[model samples]
Target: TPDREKALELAVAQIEKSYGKGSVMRLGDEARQPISVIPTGSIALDVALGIGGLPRGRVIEIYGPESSGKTTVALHAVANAQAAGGVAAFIDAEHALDPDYAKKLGVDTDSLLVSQPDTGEQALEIADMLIRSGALDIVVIDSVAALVPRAELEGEHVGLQARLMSQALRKMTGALNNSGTTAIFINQLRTGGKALKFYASVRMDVRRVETLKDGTNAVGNRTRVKVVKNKCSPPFKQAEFDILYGKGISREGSLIDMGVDQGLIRKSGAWFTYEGEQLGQGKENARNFLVENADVADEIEKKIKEKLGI
Candidate 1:
């Protein structure tokens, strides 16, 4: 008798025959599932992306001018991967990698593979190998602007170099998509022109807001990130966050503010309280209190996540 199981098997056989097997299909339920994502460790950014973080199996480009915190934001993904017991690789094409700074940003230095490639082709090859190996969870290419084509390294060829880089990225994106690896390409925006335009699943532009100062010396800066394109989530989202000198993202105050907004932290005249303890008034006081009390800070983070459904 013809049955449901028999009909399902026939459908599978026809798909395999037409698509050359293992090529085009998943269960109906699987097809409806969302792509895997890795959190960027910034709630504000995550919320803006609307996917909770960076989408895996896709190519993401973070392009911005110097000191816009693009590298820092990319490292946030590396930090997240390491925290989740996964491996990460960083290909430094610009040769400007600061190990101390990366570690300070929460990346596990002992576990990350750091390499300096002299050419864009070399960087692309290394990144492709790492992603296809299936052992690494994430890979970052630092500052594509600094990657010189071998021919260009010998002479000046801006047009030739741009075309070569574009071709390389096209191939890299296909490899990345098939490997299920989260690839982040850090790029520098030229003063009066765009960076190498390539096909990326997500493209974000980071811009500096203002420099932070402690008495006269510049500490760090706040940055505004705009999603120029997003294939895994809605595009054109924006977020502003701060990065501190020698420290990473300052999310404590962000969490506290979220808590207050969500009613997790009650406010009275001159005081903000959470869990029956006074957090003091003003944003500065609340931030200080959370930073000083580890438990309270943790609680606030938990509450924020719960409220945001992250």
Candidate 2:
């Protein structure tokens, strides 16, 4: 016991010397590793982001070209947070946020705080206020690109908007890190243009990779999420998710395939069995079986999510 105590004291002294005096605080004073996170609602995307979900008290940027599902991903974060009993708000600077669509994506219309700020500076200021107030767990900026600066709105130079965004984001990150509130900024990229760099703890680029088809009919689309930057987890991670035309994210088949690949599900001559039960041959039947048996479905789902380190 004496040796162990001495060793720990020496380690603490070394750490203090490395980081600075008084840097090693009491256990209760410093937060533990594995910081808190809010799920993005899509399991595939959640796994890809690698922090189990979006990290709270950090700034996240989701950017992509038009029709790349950037807005949908942001809404999913809000919906997921709300589902977990946390309040959230959306700043629709572009005035393109459709409440009806948000509701269909599982956002609670009755409880969400919605704001419309015409200028980028105003949007960031509002976001800072909301984040610091502690009334909401998360705030999403529908887009930074669309938040036109007043100077630009009045037909002035466009470069003024970019400068305004850079300044606002610097202040925003300071507030977010201290307030323990998660903030998501959605931005658009011009086709064939270089990606703009700004302040973000996590950065993601979404692009439509292909279309999901059901016998020649375009039933849905698939988006590939590239984790361009991640400070909390491994960077350059990539994942694909299927989004239906009217439906939301679908990862059922992918889950099943993962099970089979991991040997949790057995395949034998056009038949699939899990845990000694025949789940039938077809993919639809497998999905149906999982739906019919909620306990088994949940159990397997947990195992699958475990692969994601969640």
Highest lDDT scorer: 1
Candidate 1 CA-lDDT value: 0.75
List, residue by residue over 1-310, the lDDT tens digit for candidate 2: 9999999889988987895433454522322236467876555666666656788887888889998988888887888889988889888877787778778878897899988886767887888889878777889987776777777676664466667776777777778778878888887886101223535778899998998778889977878889887656666777777666765555465556657766878988778888788877876678667758778777876886665466
Q: By TM-score, who's the top model here?
A: 2
Kindly give the number of clashing pairs for every candidate.
0, 0
TM-score of each model, in listed order: 0.79, 0.81
Off by over 4 Å in 2: 1-35, 191-198, 269-272, 291-293
lDDT of 1 at 248: 68
Model 2 score (lDDT): 0.74
